[PDB]
Design a binder for this molecule. Sequence first.
Ligand SMILES: [Ca+2]
Ligand SMILES: [Ca+2]
Length: 461
Amino acid sequence: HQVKDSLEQLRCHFTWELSIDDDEMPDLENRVLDQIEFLDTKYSVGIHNLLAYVKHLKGQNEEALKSLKEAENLMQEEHDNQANVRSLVTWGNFAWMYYHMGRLAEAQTYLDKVENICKKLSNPFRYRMECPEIDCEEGWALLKCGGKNYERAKACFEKVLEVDPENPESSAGYAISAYRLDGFKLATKNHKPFSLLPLRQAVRLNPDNGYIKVLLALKLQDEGQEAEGEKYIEEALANMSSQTYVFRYAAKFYRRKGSVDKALELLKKALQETPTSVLLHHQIGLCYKAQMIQIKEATKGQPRGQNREKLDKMIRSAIFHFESAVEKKPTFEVAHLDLARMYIEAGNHRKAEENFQKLLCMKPVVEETMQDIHFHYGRFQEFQKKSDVNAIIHYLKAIKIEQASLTRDKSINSLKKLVLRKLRRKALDLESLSLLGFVYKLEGNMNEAEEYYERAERLAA
RNA sequence: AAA
Ligand SMILES: [Ca+2]
Ligand SMILES: [Ca+2]
């Protein structure tokens, strides 16, 4: 059992417990291929190793080996053949691949190669190489493999910064991980910009990196400093590196600024390079949604003639793009929610209902997204289905998710409005009386609350 | 990646 025990000591994709959902594998592979072709990084060993791991998980071990050989080939060709400790991730993945394929003598050869380097570098472990480069590689693998992995990814980069606070690579990984984690909390009450100072430092230490600049710009926009952020957008757009990536995030920036035409132009250019990107399709859909809203507000909700044809174009284009996003990544929960909401605008309540029903079964990494699912379904039930019974059920389910948020507040307010409406038709509706007491209780008005609960108890005679 |  010596071989397997040794393999478990290696630091590589096989031992990093990457959270990779089978339903997210097609999208992951597309994003890995996009990164190989279009993300300009100093080293590409990591991303080829991840492609090899993906091929392995697909049952394509020979294809996996080709990606590991490419990782080794690129290590020397683009860095003057110098020896680099990142190669140990590749060698670890070779050892595992050959173990799985039954090429056990070769597996041992790669273990021996790793051991030889750990000894040369006075590493304390025989196979587990302790160096910041491999902490970074572990972090980048985690960061690519889905939101479930992001606290772990951030901790990989943090471990490096605790020793070397001006390390450019881990500064960047820490900032990106922190930015995405801030995004998970962006609608929670009293959320804070933990990623802002990390992003400033990452830009300082990586001055040619336009990817980091556009994230800094977006966080500045979040924090009400749009003008400062736009300066970073312009710097990034002046650099040719990583364009689909600079363009996707700059397009978000411009959309949120209100320059929707500019956003769409950037996104359509990005789509030429990465047509499978679910982020691009979702962002394009959001641009059409914004233009739909613009048309409605200019025609006070009653477009006719060409304006109506334009509105329908926006609705059907947003549906097309949100459908494209969820076909490619069926676990993309918020794209389903935008899609359901757009089917309401198209007047297709059955397809809205279908997508809400799918959403109600999902288990999002961001648990608070279920508040929005219940809230918007409750509104659909109230306003499109004319079902107060089901609206109440789902407003209550949103409220039962206790985390304080924009949507939980809206759910309390929507329930209050619905119940007040029902009481104006029937002042002695016992259920509505107690629900109004519940609402007042959640708001803090304990005397008004108990009045209504009491009143409701009285009624039960 | 909605918000
Ligand atoms: Ca390039
Ligand atoms: Ca290739």
